[PDB]
């Protein structure tokens, strides 16, 4: 669910996901995909594409189980759709964390409607 996604992002990046990534670039947080403004944004493009595989579960409201080991995310015992979902969230939290020397506070709150239309997943 959203709570788990947000917790992972906080755990991996050290930032609160709502203010820091809820409106970032053309892809992070609210709204649809768009042509990515940078690497942080790209993590979010891939993540929204990853959510396209969730045929029988809602990434927003369906809870999955995962553990947060010594700085490590491990997706738990889940049904197949929730497995996919957790792995989507895990990959975005690790991806965001990974490009943190490129995060652009200018993109934090982006005029998403002006974005170039997104390529096909």
From Swiss-Prot:
Tissue: Expressed by the venom gland.
GO CC term, one of those recorded: extracellular region
Pfam families reported in the protein's UniProt record: Phospholip_A2_1
SUPFAM superfamilies in alphabetical order: Phospholipase A2, PLA2
Cell compartment(s), UniProt: Secreted
TM spans (from-to): none
Keywords tagged on the record: Cytolysis, Disulfide bond, Myotoxin, Secreted, Toxin
Gene3D superfamilies for the chain: Phospholipase A2 domain (1.20.90.10)
Single annotated GO MF: calcium-dependent phospholipase A2 activity
Disulphide connectivity of cysteines: 26-115, 28-44, 43-95, 49-121, 50-88, 57-81, 75-86
Biological process, per Gene Ontology: arachidonate secretion; killing of cells of another organism; lipid catabolic process; negative regulation of T cell proliferation; phospholipid metabolic process
InterPro entries reported in the protein's UniProt record: PLipase_A2 (IPR001211), PLipase_A2_dom (IPR016090), PLipase_A2_dom_sf (IPR036444), PLipase_A2_His_AS (IPR033113)
Biological role: Snake venom phospholipase A2 homolog that lacks enzymatic activity, but has myotoxic and cytolytic activities.
Annotated family: Belongs to the phospholipase A2 family. Group II subfamily. K49 sub-subfamily.
Description of how the protein assembles with itself and partners: Homodimer.
Protein name according to UniProt: Basic phospholipase A2 homolog
Species in which this protein is naturally found: Metlapilcoatlus nummifer
